[PDB]
Design an enzyme around this catalytic site. Structure first.
Site, PDB file in Angstrom:
ATOM      1  N   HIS A 162      62.932 -23.914  -0.415  1.00 25.25           N
ATOM      2  CA  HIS A 162      61.597 -23.326  -0.345  1.00 25.25           C
ATOM      3  C   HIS A 162      60.948 -23.938  -1.583  1.00 25.25           C
ATOM      4  CE1 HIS A 162      62.670 -20.158   2.579  1.00 25.25           C
ATOM      5  NE2 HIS A 162      63.853 -20.257   1.998  1.00 25.25           N
ATOM      6  N   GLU A 211      61.353 -18.135  -4.111  1.00 25.65           N
ATOM      7  CA  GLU A 211      61.138 -16.881  -3.407  1.00 25.65           C
ATOM      8  C   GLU A 211      61.533 -15.762  -4.361  1.00 25.65           C
ATOM      9  OE1 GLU A 211      63.013 -17.491   0.593  1.00 25.65           O
ATOM     10  OE2 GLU A 211      60.877 -17.604   1.088  1.00 25.65           O
ATOM     11  N   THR A 265      64.640 -14.301   4.490  1.00 25.73           N
ATOM     12  CA  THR A 265      63.303 -14.314   3.907  1.00 25.73           C
ATOM     13  C   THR A 265      62.303 -14.895   4.900  1.00 25.73           C
ATOM     14  OG1 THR A 265      63.556 -16.503   2.938  1.00 25.73           O
ATOM     15  CG2 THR A 265      64.257 -14.610   1.613  1.00 25.73           C
ATOM     16  N   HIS A 298      68.947 -25.123   2.848  1.00 30.32           N
ATOM     17  CA  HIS A 298      67.559 -25.547   2.923  1.00 30.32           C
ATOM     18  C   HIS A 298      66.899 -25.106   1.630  1.00 30.32           C
ATOM     19  CE1 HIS A 298      67.627 -21.328   4.150  1.00 30.32           C
ATOM     20  NE2 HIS A 298      66.452 -21.266   3.547  1.00 30.32           N
ATOM     21  N   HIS A 337      68.822 -22.521  -0.813  1.00 30.53           N
ATOM     22  CA  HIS A 337      69.554 -21.458  -0.134  1.00 30.53           C
ATOM     23  C   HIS A 337      70.697 -22.036   0.686  1.00 30.53           C
ATOM     24  CE1 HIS A 337      65.841 -18.565  -0.178  1.00 30.53           C
ATOM     25  NE2 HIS A 337      66.483 -18.592  -1.332  1.00 30.53           N
ATOM     26  N   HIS A 368      59.268 -25.126   9.317  1.00 32.98           N
ATOM     27  CA  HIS A 368      58.983 -24.322   8.131  1.00 32.98           C
ATOM     28  C   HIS A 368      59.717 -24.824   6.888  1.00 32.98           C
ATOM     29  CE1 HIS A 368      62.200 -22.175  10.409  1.00 32.98           C
ATOM     30  NE2 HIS A 368      62.728 -21.924   9.224  1.00 32.98           N
TER      31      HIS A 368
HETATM   32  N1  LIG Z   1      65.682 -18.000   3.688  1.00 33.05           N
HETATM   33  S1  LIG Z   1      67.090 -17.476   4.139  1.00 33.05           S
HETATM   34  O1  LIG Z   1      68.092 -18.115   3.338  1.00 33.05           O
HETATM   35  O2  LIG Z   1      67.027 -16.040   4.156  1.00 33.05           O
HETATM   36  C1  LIG Z   1      67.416 -18.020   5.803  1.00 33.05           C
HETATM   37  C2  LIG Z   1      66.479 -18.890   6.388  1.00 33.05           C
HETATM   38  C3  LIG Z   1      66.680 -19.365   7.691  1.00 33.05           C
HETATM   39  N2  LIG Z   1      65.667 -20.307   8.282  1.00 33.05           N
HETATM   40  O3  LIG Z   1      64.288 -20.081   8.067  1.00 33.05           O
HETATM   41  O4  LIG Z   1      66.100 -21.439   9.026  1.00 33.05           O
HETATM   42  C4  LIG Z   1      67.828 -18.973   8.436  1.00 33.05           C
HETATM   43  C5  LIG Z   1      68.765 -18.102   7.849  1.00 33.05           C
HETATM   44  C6  LIG Z   1      68.571 -17.617   6.524  1.00 33.05           C
HETATM   45 CL1  LIG Z   1      69.715 -16.572   5.818  1.00 33.05          CL
HETATM   46 HG   LIG Z   2      59.528 -22.827  11.950  1.00 33.84          HG
HETATM   47 ZN   LIG Z   3      65.703 -19.652   2.568  1.00 30.14          ZN
END
Ligand SMILES: NS(=O)(=O)c1cc([N+](=O)[O-])ccc1Cl
Ligand SMILES: [Hg+2]
Ligand SMILES: [Zn+2]
Ligand SMILES: [Cl-]
EC number: 4.2.1.1
Length: 258
Positions: A94, A104, A196, A92, A117, A62
């Site tokens: 988005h 987001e 998220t 990571h 993030h 993802h």
């Molecule tokens: N998008 S996020 O930062 O809320 C988040 C994403 C994932 N992920 O999709 O690997 C794991 C932890 C968190 Cl806090």
């Molecule tokens: Hg995934």
């Molecule tokens: Zn994220």
């Protein structure tokens, strides 16, 4: 039929397997700058990444995660709305299929090209696993990306993406300094939220920086060359891996600045 960002497994479908998707503190949210209120009770935000130790980068299906060795007291986030110390475990992004979308969180409904993030867990809970069972287990530092001048500190990440094109692929990624991805100002908005992405757990104290960082069109274009699919499968470009703004409900967004 795994969750994703497509028409049949996207954000509007997640609630079926993850009912909390319609919860009381879901993320992301639109940040109404005029409704946000300056909070004097907020202490100075502290981002100490000097000893950050990255281990590897992974395409998880993802997005891609730059993982850090969080076995020791290094790369910590504290201060601001946070009580105690939170340890960096991974970061990571988005992003969108076009520069006009990808983030987001939104600011007065404005969507940025992407959003970074940096995920941290509350050290009082021992580790990430135990932390995600707590209402204040995580702290995510969110940073917006806009397309303009290149961000030199991001190039090392961009150049390694060719080696983790498809889902499941990973590669060693040591000595990457996340300090090179931070804007000048630490002014921010904060509110209680969630992951998220499924499982959408409501354990996150969100800290979203007001100042975006600029990245070049070339850099984001390489993000869009990644694949959602695994090796040997039909190509599905990894784009628009963002969840839209969710209902603010009974929450107030606080600002660290006047
Ligand atoms: N998008 S996020 O930062 O809320 C988040 C994403 C994932 N992920 O999709 O690997 C794991 C932890 C968190 Cl806090
Ligand atoms: Hg995934
Ligand atoms: Zn994220
Ligand atoms: Cl899964």
């Amino acid at each position: 039929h795994h969750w994703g960002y497509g028409k049949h497994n996207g954000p509007e479908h997640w609630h079926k397997d993850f009912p909390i998707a319609k919860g009381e503190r879901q993320s992301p949210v639109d940040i109404d700058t005029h409704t946000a209120k300056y909070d004097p009770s907020l202490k100075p935000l502290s981002v100490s990444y000097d000893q950050a130790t990255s281990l590897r980068i992974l395409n998880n299906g993802h997005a891609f995660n730059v993982e850090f060795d969080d076995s020791q007291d290094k790369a910590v986030l504290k201060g601001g709305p946070l009580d105690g110390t939170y340890r960096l475990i991974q970061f990571h992004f988005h992003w969108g299929s076009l520069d006009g979308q990808g983030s987001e969180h939104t600011v007065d409904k404005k969507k940025y090209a992407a959003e970074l993030h940096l995920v941290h867990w509350n050290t009082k809970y021992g580790d990430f696993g135990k932390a995600v069972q707590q209402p204040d287990g995580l702290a995510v530092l969110g940073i917006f990306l806009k397309v303009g001048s290149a961000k030199p500190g991001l190039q090392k990440v961009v150049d390694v993406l060719d080696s983790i094109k498809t889902k499941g692929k990973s590669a060693d990624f040591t000595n990457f300094d996340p300090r090179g991805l931070l804007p000048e100002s630490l002014d921010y908005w904060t509110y209680p939220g969630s992951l998220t992405t499924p499982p959408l757990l409501e354990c996150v104290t969100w800290i979203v920086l007001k100042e975006p960082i600029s990245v070049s069109s070339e850099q984001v274009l390489k993000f869009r060359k990644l694949n959602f699919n695994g090796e040997g499968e039909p190509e599905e470009l990894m784009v628009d891996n963002w969840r839209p703004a969710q209902p603010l409900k009974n929450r107030q967004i606080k600002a660290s600045f006047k």
